Amino acid sequence: KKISGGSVVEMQGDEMTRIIWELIKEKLIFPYVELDLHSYDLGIENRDATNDQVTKDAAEAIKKHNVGVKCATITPDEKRVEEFKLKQMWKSPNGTIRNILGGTVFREAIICKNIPRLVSGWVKPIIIGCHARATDFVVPGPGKVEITYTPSDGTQKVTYLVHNFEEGGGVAMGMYNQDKSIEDFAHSSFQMALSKGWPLYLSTKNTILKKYDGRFKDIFQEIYDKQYKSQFEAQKIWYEHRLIDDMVAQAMKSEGGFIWACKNVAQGYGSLGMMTSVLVCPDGKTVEAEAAHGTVTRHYRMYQKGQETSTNPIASIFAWTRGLAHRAKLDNNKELAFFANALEEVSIETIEAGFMTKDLAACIKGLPNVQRSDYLNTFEFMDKLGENLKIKLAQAK
Amino acid sequence: KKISGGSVVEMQGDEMTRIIWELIKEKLIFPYVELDLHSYDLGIENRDATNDQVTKDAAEAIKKHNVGVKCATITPDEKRVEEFKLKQMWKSPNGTIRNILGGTVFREAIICKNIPRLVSGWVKPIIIGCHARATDFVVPGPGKVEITYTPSDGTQKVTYLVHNFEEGGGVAMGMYNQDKSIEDFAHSSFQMALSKGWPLYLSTKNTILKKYDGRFKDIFQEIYDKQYKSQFEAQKIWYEHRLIDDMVAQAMKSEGGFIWACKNVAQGYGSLGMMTSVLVCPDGKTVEAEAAHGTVTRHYRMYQKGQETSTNPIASIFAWTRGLAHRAKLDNNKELAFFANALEEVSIETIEAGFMTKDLAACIKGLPNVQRSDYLNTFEFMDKLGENLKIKLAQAK
Ligand SMILES: NC(=O)C1=CN([C@@H]2O[C@H](COP(=O)(O)OP(=O)(O)OC[C@H]3O[C@@H](n4cnc5c(N)ncnc54)[C@H](OP(=O)(O)O)[C@@H]3O)[C@@H](O)[C@H]2O)C=CC1
Ligand SMILES: NC(=O)C1=CN([C@@H]2O[C@H](COP(=O)(O)OP(=O)(O)OC[C@H]3O[C@@H](n4cnc5c(N)ncnc54)[C@H](OP(=O)(O)O)[C@@H]3O)[C@@H](O)[C@H]2O)C=CC1
């Protein structure tokens, strides 16, 4: 029956995912597990009427229960504020959500065999973490651009000279990082490895800045030897520092299945609707899993019309299965764990079953070469994911 | 016979390319064209004995005649200084060469059909330009990191605050660019398009820094409208600004054949011995064309042994054919132009002729799966490039 689910946060979405999000709850999640949900609407009007207050009210809950999940929501813009008669510009709910949570976002393609990739060789996805601003300016004429660090503890001020613009103008900037944040990035990176048991690779460009990587190279390595190395080395997982061209070579040469990292994003070898974006918290309890794509606006603007369209759920599903199978690690539950793990099967295997959406079929055959009988629509594809799931449960337990 | 060649600089190399460089001169270049060469040895001992003075003596010549070409040379390191009993550490000859020349380096894979790539769809190579240091530091404790720009013209000093480290430490940095350099990067980028008639794409990440791109986005656009736009638009070529994920998507979706650009490298879809790296000067006369790979040390260390090895010339060749076919644009020569253009055929077509080296066959079949009868060695492959060239001239003129 419905099975005991912990307390698993939710966040309602906007547009074509707010659709897709629902059929996932009602077909693919509710029937089977019973999670006690705290479901905090991020639907734009509610964010608009209640003026940002619901976003926080959720972001503080996810930190409490330790598992959130999120539909893709519309960051208002000029048009977005104006379309719905919104009463304000609303910074991206994530920027609200994330910075309340903290943490580091790991985007992970979910890889299917029949889906073409960038590397033909990748069996497992590379998970790409990235850390995360800065101040810059012009210098319209000659002068000394010299960054000046004044200590607040009272001692000798220490400054350096970045450059001297003598002929005319130029451009110049600062950047910074707090070791505090950097250290949350290691833990988010390390336990995202341990969550997946994958090898972690920090990457840097050493030559270009030495002390700067020299913290990032060390401040992980200062954590690895210190802590996770035991849980890494035994458990077969392990960490390695690396350099861009070094790995991004082997990253092209490998099967995948490692936790990348970087410093300052979509790109990807899969479609936008394949990418799953998990915000892992630095404490390792709390996991906020949203599909990486947008609200699939082109698809919805045709759904108003009732026109039959194809919007790929799998990223939205695998929000849940990163949330469900996380709660099960916090709860040491295998009734919740095995459910997702089998849902991720049924979700992916459905595409090895030939049942795909238009965006995937438009990956394979190309843009024109797809015909409506080459794929399944936004509603049809979802329905199979129930069909194969229950048939899977039929033979599972 | 030998045909009238202008004045085309040369630079001798080290190790396995200093080999490969020669057979290219003697088989593939000398017999056919007679260039009046100013050939300035960069062989390490000569750089070591004459203590950097020959590198400059060449770098000032290339700027004079306007066409250089360069074998791959060994930047000394600890081991490299010590191996040859070198009397000093020698900064990379390019850093000497380039900074004397100035300019911007455009690496270009030379693409063959039978050679696998990153994108299956690329018919033409993407040319990736990149502009080019900086000062960074730690901040061991609390304080104000505030970049401080003092004008030298005497007016109000203007500073900004990058961040305030309050709890403990962190890391922080400056960076800069002179509009002067940035403007050489446009011209190097623009005439590298016009040299090839390819569309140029600047790329930036706008959000992350606004005014900073705001120069780079403008300072090209300020040059395009100003000058090349006529020579671009008519002549069918054109410029477009772009953003990373925007193009690096379409860059995955395209045939290739555009001049990329970036801001702060090998990577690549071809082998290291396929990449050709052309340093284009901002004045558009002077072109310093080296193969992008190294001196192929693993191959040479086995060439001392006499062991029969495979070192792929094509990058070293296409140094010349970027130099030869450049001189012909400065000289409005079609006896020199058609030679290279036909050599690049014969060089690439040789690989469509199935004649390849081990590194390419090790691209296709994989590392183990290649057998010595799957490819041709360092000497054999070169020899065909004479065989097919002369047979090509037999039917050409
Ligand atoms: N917080 C979040 O998670 C994010 C939210 N957003 C929201 O989305 C809006 C902009 O995103 P949007 O323009 O939709 O970009 P998306 O890529 O999310 O979707 C719109 C376009 O991308 C393609 N696409 C994306 N996902 C799919 C899918 N699952 N199936 C088929 N096609 C897909 C579609 O191409 P085609 O239909 O031609 O196949 C469509 O033209 C913003 O207003 C923002 O609010 C955006 C990014 C992240
Ligand atoms: N200024 C320049 O142009 C540059 C010069 N260098 C010089 O080279 C040295 C380091 O480079 P290196 O270690 O040789 O790296 P390279 O990639 O240039 O060559 C060495 C290794 O790379 C592979 N490789 C590279 N080119 C080829 C080729 N044409 N055919 C087959 N294999 C190739 C080889 O693998 P395998 O043999 O297993 O196939 C070999 O193990 C430095 O000392 C430096 O002086 C380096 C970079 C740039």
PDB file of N, CA, C and O in Angstrom, chain A residues 53-100:
ATOM      1  N   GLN A  53       7.256  35.568   0.548  1.00  0.00           N
ATOM      2  CA  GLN A  53       7.283  35.020   1.891  1.00  0.00           C
ATOM      3  C   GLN A  53       7.091  33.511   1.907  1.00  0.00           C
ATOM      4  O   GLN A  53       7.483  32.865   2.880  1.00  0.00           O
ATOM      5  N   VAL A  54       6.532  32.927   0.849  1.00  0.00           N
ATOM      6  CA  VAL A  54       6.337  31.480   0.872  1.00  0.00           C
ATOM      7  C   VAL A  54       7.620  30.756   0.504  1.00  0.00           C
ATOM      8  O   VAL A  54       7.891  29.665   1.014  1.00  0.00           O
ATOM      9  N   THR A  55       8.431  31.357  -0.366  1.00  0.00           N
ATOM     10  CA  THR A  55       9.690  30.752  -0.776  1.00  0.00           C
ATOM     11  C   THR A  55      10.572  30.496   0.436  1.00  0.00           C
ATOM     12  O   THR A  55      11.032  29.374   0.666  1.00  0.00           O
ATOM     13  N   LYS A  56      10.787  31.527   1.246  1.00  0.00           N
ATOM     14  CA  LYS A  56      11.528  31.352   2.485  1.00  0.00           C
ATOM     15  C   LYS A  56      10.856  30.326   3.384  1.00  0.00           C
ATOM     16  O   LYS A  56      11.515  29.430   3.919  1.00  0.00           O
ATOM     17  N   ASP A  57       9.537  30.441   3.557  1.00  0.00           N
ATOM     18  CA  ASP A  57       8.823  29.533   4.446  1.00  0.00           C
ATOM     19  C   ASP A  57       9.065  28.081   4.065  1.00  0.00           C
ATOM     20  O   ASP A  57       9.023  27.197   4.927  1.00  0.00           O
ATOM     21  N   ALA A  58       9.313  27.811   2.782  1.00  0.00           N
ATOM     22  CA  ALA A  58       9.715  26.470   2.373  1.00  0.00           C
ATOM     23  C   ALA A  58      11.198  26.240   2.605  1.00  0.00           C
ATOM     24  O   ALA A  58      11.595  25.189   3.121  1.00  0.00           O
ATOM     25  N   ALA A  59      12.024  27.217   2.238  1.00  0.00           N
ATOM     26  CA  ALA A  59      13.467  27.041   2.319  1.00  0.00           C
ATOM     27  C   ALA A  59      13.911  26.759   3.739  1.00  0.00           C
ATOM     28  O   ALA A  59      14.928  26.093   3.954  1.00  0.00           O
ATOM     29  N   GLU A  60      13.162  27.255   4.719  1.00  0.00           N
ATOM     30  CA  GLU A  60      13.439  26.937   6.107  1.00  0.00           C
ATOM     31  C   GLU A  60      12.879  25.587   6.512  1.00  0.00           C
ATOM     32  O   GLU A  60      13.339  25.011   7.499  1.00  0.00           O
ATOM     33  N   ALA A  61      11.905  25.068   5.769  1.00  0.00           N
ATOM     34  CA  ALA A  61      11.381  23.742   6.068  1.00  0.00           C
ATOM     35  C   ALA A  61      12.306  22.649   5.561  1.00  0.00           C
ATOM     36  O   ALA A  61      12.577  21.681   6.282  1.00  0.00           O
ATOM     37  N   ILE A  62      12.788  22.777   4.318  1.00  0.00           N
ATOM     38  CA  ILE A  62      13.669  21.760   3.751  1.00  0.00           C
ATOM     39  C   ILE A  62      14.854  21.518   4.668  1.00  0.00           C
ATOM     40  O   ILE A  62      15.277  20.378   4.881  1.00  0.00           O
ATOM     41  N   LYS A  63      15.418  22.595   5.207  1.00  0.00           N
ATOM     42  CA  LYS A  63      16.502  22.506   6.171  1.00  0.00           C
ATOM     43  C   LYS A  63      16.078  21.768   7.429  1.00  0.00           C
ATOM     44  O   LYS A  63      16.930  21.246   8.152  1.00  0.00           O
ATOM     45  N   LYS A  64      14.775  21.704   7.694  1.00  0.00           N
ATOM     46  CA  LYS A  64      14.273  21.051   8.894  1.00  0.00           C
ATOM     47  C   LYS A  64      14.108  19.557   8.682  1.00  0.00           C
ATOM     48  O   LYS A  64      14.607  18.747   9.467  1.00  0.00           O
ATOM     49  N   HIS A  65      13.316  19.185   7.689  1.00  0.00           N
ATOM     50  CA  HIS A  65      13.070  17.783   7.400  1.00  0.00           C
ATOM     51  C   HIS A  65      14.258  17.119   6.722  1.00  0.00           C
ATOM     52  O   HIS A  65      14.478  15.919   6.905  1.00  0.00           O
ATOM     53  N   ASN A  66      15.029  17.890   5.962  1.00  0.00           N
ATOM     54  CA  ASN A  66      16.246  17.538   5.241  1.00  0.00           C
ATOM     55  C   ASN A  66      16.002  16.965   3.838  1.00  0.00           C
ATOM     56  O   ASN A  66      16.973  16.580   3.191  1.00  0.00           O
ATOM     57  N   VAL A  67      14.771  16.846   3.354  1.00  0.00           N
ATOM     58  CA  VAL A  67      14.566  16.475   1.962  1.00  0.00           C
ATOM     59  C   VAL A  67      13.531  17.410   1.364  1.00  0.00           C
ATOM     60  O   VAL A  67      12.359  17.357   1.740  1.00  0.00           O
ATOM     61  N   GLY A  68      13.950  18.251   0.422  1.00  0.00           N
ATOM     62  CA  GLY A  68      13.039  18.973  -0.433  1.00  0.00           C
ATOM     63  C   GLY A  68      13.031  18.421  -1.847  1.00  0.00           C
ATOM     64  O   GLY A  68      13.916  17.683  -2.251  1.00  0.00           O
ATOM     65  N   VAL A  69      12.013  18.821  -2.607  1.00  0.00           N
ATOM     66  CA  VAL A  69      11.940  18.573  -4.045  1.00  0.00           C
ATOM     67  C   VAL A  69      11.192  19.736  -4.664  1.00  0.00           C
ATOM     68  O   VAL A  69      10.324  20.340  -4.035  1.00  0.00           O
ATOM     69  N   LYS A  70      11.532  20.060  -5.900  1.00  0.00           N
ATOM     70  CA  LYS A  70      11.100  21.324  -6.464  1.00  0.00           C
ATOM     71  C   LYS A  70      10.716  21.159  -7.921  1.00  0.00           C
ATOM     72  O   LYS A  70      11.500  20.641  -8.717  1.00  0.00           O
ATOM     73  N   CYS A  71       9.519  21.606  -8.266  1.00  0.00           N
ATOM     74  CA  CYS A  71       9.153  21.802  -9.658  1.00  0.00           C
ATOM     75  C   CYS A  71       9.867  23.031 -10.213  1.00  0.00           C
ATOM     76  O   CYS A  71      10.341  23.895  -9.472  1.00  0.00           O
ATOM     77  N   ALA A  72       9.959  23.102 -11.535  1.00  0.00           N
ATOM     78  CA  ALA A  72      10.618  24.240 -12.162  1.00  0.00           C
ATOM     79  C   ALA A  72       9.689  25.446 -12.161  1.00  0.00           C
ATOM     80  O   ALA A  72       8.549  25.362 -12.624  1.00  0.00           O
ATOM     81  N   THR A  73      10.183  26.567 -11.657  1.00  0.00           N
ATOM     82  CA  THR A  73       9.364  27.735 -11.391  1.00  0.00           C
ATOM     83  C   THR A  73       9.880  28.925 -12.179  1.00  0.00           C
ATOM     84  O   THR A  73      11.047  28.977 -12.563  1.00  0.00           O
ATOM     85  N   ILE A  74       9.006  29.898 -12.397  1.00  0.00           N
ATOM     86  CA  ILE A  74       9.299  30.999 -13.302  1.00  0.00           C
ATOM     87  C   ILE A  74       9.873  32.162 -12.512  1.00  0.00           C
ATOM     88  O   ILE A  74       9.158  32.820 -11.760  1.00  0.00           O
ATOM     89  N   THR A  75      11.151  32.434 -12.712  1.00  0.00           N
ATOM     90  CA  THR A  75      11.744  33.675 -12.233  1.00  0.00           C
ATOM     91  C   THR A  75      11.140  34.820 -13.024  1.00  0.00           C
ATOM     92  O   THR A  75      11.283  34.848 -14.253  1.00  0.00           O
ATOM     93  N   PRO A  76      10.467  35.772 -12.382  1.00  0.00           N
ATOM     94  CA  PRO A  76       9.862  36.871 -13.132  1.00  0.00           C
ATOM     95  C   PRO A  76      10.902  37.736 -13.822  1.00  0.00           C
ATOM     96  O   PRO A  76      12.002  37.954 -13.313  1.00  0.00           O
ATOM     97  N   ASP A  77      10.536  38.219 -15.004  1.00  0.00           N
ATOM     98  CA  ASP A  77      11.304  39.222 -15.722  1.00  0.00           C
ATOM     99  C   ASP A  77      10.376  40.380 -16.070  1.00  0.00           C
ATOM    100  O   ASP A  77       9.239  40.438 -15.584  1.00  0.00           O
ATOM    101  N   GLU A  78      10.855  41.309 -16.895  1.00  0.00           N
ATOM    102  CA  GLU A  78       9.984  42.343 -17.435  1.00  0.00           C
ATOM    103  C   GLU A  78       8.677  41.747 -17.947  1.00  0.00           C
ATOM    104  O   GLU A  78       7.591  42.080 -17.462  1.00  0.00           O
ATOM    105  N   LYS A  79       8.772  40.853 -18.936  1.00  0.00           N
ATOM    106  CA  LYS A  79       7.576  40.238 -19.502  1.00  0.00           C
ATOM    107  C   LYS A  79       6.832  39.411 -18.461  1.00  0.00           C
ATOM    108  O   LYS A  79       5.598  39.434 -18.406  1.00  0.00           O
ATOM    109  N   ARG A  80       7.566  38.676 -17.626  1.00  0.00           N
ATOM    110  CA  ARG A  80       6.923  37.786 -16.667  1.00  0.00           C
ATOM    111  C   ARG A  80       6.188  38.566 -15.585  1.00  0.00           C
ATOM    112  O   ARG A  80       5.054  38.222 -15.230  1.00  0.00           O
ATOM    113  N   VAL A  81       6.817  39.610 -15.037  1.00  0.00           N
ATOM    114  CA  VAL A  81       6.082  40.500 -14.142  1.00  0.00           C
ATOM    115  C   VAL A  81       4.863  41.058 -14.862  1.00  0.00           C
ATOM    116  O   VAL A  81       3.738  41.011 -14.353  1.00  0.00           O
ATOM    117  N   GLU A  82       5.061  41.542 -16.085  1.00  0.00           N
ATOM    118  CA  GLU A  82       3.983  42.243 -16.766  1.00  0.00           C
ATOM    119  C   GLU A  82       2.885  41.298 -17.241  1.00  0.00           C
ATOM    120  O   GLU A  82       1.710  41.671 -17.206  1.00  0.00           O
ATOM    121  N   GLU A  83       3.237  40.086 -17.691  1.00  0.00           N
ATOM    122  CA  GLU A  83       2.227  39.143 -18.177  1.00  0.00           C
ATOM    123  C   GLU A  83       1.141  38.900 -17.136  1.00  0.00           C
ATOM    124  O   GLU A  83      -0.055  39.030 -17.421  1.00  0.00           O
ATOM    125  N   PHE A  84       1.546  38.533 -15.927  1.00  0.00           N
ATOM    126  CA  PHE A  84       0.629  38.129 -14.873  1.00  0.00           C
ATOM    127  C   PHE A  84       0.199  39.287 -13.996  1.00  0.00           C
ATOM    128  O   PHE A  84      -0.431  39.054 -12.960  1.00  0.00           O
ATOM    129  N   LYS A  85       0.557  40.518 -14.366  1.00  0.00           N
ATOM    130  CA  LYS A  85       0.336  41.688 -13.515  1.00  0.00           C
ATOM    131  C   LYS A  85       0.973  41.470 -12.149  1.00  0.00           C
ATOM    132  O   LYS A  85       0.346  41.655 -11.103  1.00  0.00           O
ATOM    133  N   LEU A  86       2.235  41.053 -12.173  1.00  0.00           N
ATOM    134  CA  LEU A  86       2.972  40.841 -10.942  1.00  0.00           C
ATOM    135  C   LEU A  86       3.321  42.178 -10.304  1.00  0.00           C
ATOM    136  O   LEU A  86       3.600  43.170 -10.982  1.00  0.00           O
ATOM    137  N   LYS A  87       3.312  42.191  -8.979  1.00  0.00           N
ATOM    138  CA  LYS A  87       3.493  43.403  -8.201  1.00  0.00           C
ATOM    139  C   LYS A  87       4.952  43.702  -7.884  1.00  0.00           C
ATOM    140  O   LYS A  87       5.221  44.645  -7.133  1.00  0.00           O
ATOM    141  N   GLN A  88       5.893  42.944  -8.447  1.00  0.00           N
ATOM    142  CA  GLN A  88       7.311  43.138  -8.164  1.00  0.00           C
ATOM    143  C   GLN A  88       8.150  42.202  -9.025  1.00  0.00           C
ATOM    144  O   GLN A  88       7.666  41.182  -9.523  1.00  0.00           O
ATOM    145  N   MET A  89       9.420  42.575  -9.193  1.00  0.00           N
ATOM    146  CA  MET A  89      10.443  41.691  -9.731  1.00  0.00           C
ATOM    147  C   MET A  89      10.862  40.708  -8.652  1.00  0.00           C
ATOM    148  O   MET A  89      11.098  41.093  -7.502  1.00  0.00           O
ATOM    149  N   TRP A  90      10.945  39.441  -9.006  1.00  0.00           N
ATOM    150  CA  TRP A  90      11.216  38.412  -8.018  1.00  0.00           C
ATOM    151  C   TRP A  90      12.477  37.660  -8.407  1.00  0.00           C
ATOM    152  O   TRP A  90      12.483  36.904  -9.381  1.00  0.00           O
ATOM    153  N   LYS A  91      13.534  37.872  -7.629  1.00  0.00           N
ATOM    154  CA  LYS A  91      14.786  37.174  -7.841  1.00  0.00           C
ATOM    155  C   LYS A  91      14.521  35.683  -7.836  1.00  0.00           C
ATOM    156  O   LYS A  91      13.593  35.207  -7.177  1.00  0.00           O
ATOM    157  N   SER A  92      15.322  34.960  -8.607  1.00  0.00           N
ATOM    158  CA  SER A  92      15.067  33.563  -8.888  1.00  0.00           C
ATOM    159  C   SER A  92      14.792  32.813  -7.590  1.00  0.00           C
ATOM    160  O   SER A  92      15.597  32.895  -6.651  1.00  0.00           O
ATOM    161  N   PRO A  93      13.674  32.099  -7.493  1.00  0.00           N
ATOM    162  CA  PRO A  93      13.355  31.398  -6.241  1.00  0.00           C
ATOM    163  C   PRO A  93      14.511  30.587  -5.700  1.00  0.00           C
ATOM    164  O   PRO A  93      14.689  30.524  -4.483  1.00  0.00           O
ATOM    165  N   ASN A  94      15.318  29.984  -6.579  1.00  0.00           N
ATOM    166  CA  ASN A  94      16.492  29.244  -6.138  1.00  0.00           C
ATOM    167  C   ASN A  94      17.437  30.136  -5.354  1.00  0.00           C
ATOM    168  O   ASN A  94      17.819  29.813  -4.225  1.00  0.00           O
ATOM    169  N   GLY A  95      17.846  31.255  -5.953  1.00  0.00           N
ATOM    170  CA  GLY A  95      18.700  32.191  -5.243  1.00  0.00           C
ATOM    171  C   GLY A  95      18.160  32.492  -3.866  1.00  0.00           C
ATOM    172  O   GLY A  95      18.911  32.576  -2.892  1.00  0.00           O
ATOM    173  N   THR A  96      16.841  32.620  -3.756  1.00  0.00           N
ATOM    174  CA  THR A  96      16.225  32.628  -2.442  1.00  0.00           C
ATOM    175  C   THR A  96      16.384  31.270  -1.780  1.00  0.00           C
ATOM    176  O   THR A  96      17.006  31.154  -0.726  1.00  0.00           O
ATOM    177  N   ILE A  97      15.885  30.217  -2.432  1.00  0.00           N
ATOM    178  CA  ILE A  97      15.939  28.871  -1.858  1.00  0.00           C
ATOM    179  C   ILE A  97      17.366  28.502  -1.497  1.00  0.00           C
ATOM    180  O   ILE A  97      17.686  28.216  -0.337  1.00  0.00           O
ATOM    181  N   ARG A  98      18.249  28.520  -2.491  1.00  0.00           N
ATOM    182  CA  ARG A  98      19.583  27.980  -2.290  1.00  0.00           C
ATOM    183  C   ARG A  98      20.285  28.699  -1.154  1.00  0.00           C
ATOM    184  O   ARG A  98      20.681  28.084  -0.160  1.00  0.00           O
ATOM    185  N   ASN A  99      20.402  30.022  -1.267  1.00  0.00           N
ATOM    186  CA  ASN A  99      21.158  30.782  -0.284  1.00  0.00           C
ATOM    187  C   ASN A  99      20.599  30.615   1.124  1.00  0.00           C
ATOM    188  O   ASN A  99      21.343  30.729   2.101  1.00  0.00           O
ATOM    189  N   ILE A 100      19.309  30.324   1.255  1.00  0.00           N
ATOM    190  CA  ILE A 100      18.793  29.899   2.551  1.00  0.00           C
ATOM    191  C   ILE A 100      19.350  28.527   2.905  1.00  0.00           C
ATOM    192  O   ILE A 100      19.895  28.319   3.993  1.00  0.00           O
TER     193      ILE A 100
END
